């Protein structure tokens, strides 16, 4: 869907921004700093579900640019494992939210965050 590589870069950066707001806005809830409303969190995690599937297709062939390391493309099966671990932890987070359990949510949120960081550390260029 991208006319030039820069269009894929812009898309994935926007998707990751949006996805990252939906994740991070739950931090006060899982820390107990903000109240836990099970329906609110279930709806938010549904939005995060959708968003968390979107970035990866915008790292096609020859979309080098932005802060994406070239290793994303030359080590494709591996990058795919970092992405698939992350989305399987998103499935777990959905399960916790859908069930309405703050303990389970806390644990699942931590697992997702660890998977964000694992990919970050391997595949996002240094700042």
Q: How far apart are CA 73 and CA 59, in angstroms?
A: 8
Residues 46-65 that bind a second copy (CB under 8 A): 47, 50-51, 54
Q: At its nearest, how many Å lie between a second copy and the CB of residue 109?
A: 15
Residue 113 half-sphere exposure toward CB, CA atoms < 13 A: 14
Residue 124's binding partner among ligand HEC, a second copy, none (Cβ under 5 to 8 angstroms by kind) is ligand HEC
Residues 15-44 that bind a second copy (CB under 8 A): 15, 17-18, 21, 24-25
| Residues making up the binding site for heme c | 12-13, 67, 116, 119-120
Binding site for a second copy (CB under 8 A): 1, 10-11, 13-15, 17-18, 21, 24-25, 47, 50-51, 54
């Amino acid at each position: 869907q991208f006319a030039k590589p820069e269009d894929a870069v812009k898309y994935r950066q926007s998707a990751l921004t949006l996805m990252a707001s939906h994740f991070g806005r739950m931090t006060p809830v899982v820390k107990g700093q903000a109240p836990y409303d099970a329906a609110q969190i279930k709806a938010n995690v549904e939005v995060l579900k959708t968003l968390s599937a979107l970035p990866w297709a915008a790292f096609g062939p020859g979309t080098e640019g932005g802060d994406a390391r070239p290793e994303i493309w030359s080590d494709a099966a591996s990058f795919k494992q970092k992405q698939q671990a992350f989305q399987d932890n998103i499935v777990k987070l959905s399960a916790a939210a859908d069930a309405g359990d703050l303990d389970k949510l806390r644990a699942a949120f931590g697992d997702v965050g660890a998977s964000c960081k694992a990919c970050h550390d391997a595949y996002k260029k240094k700042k």
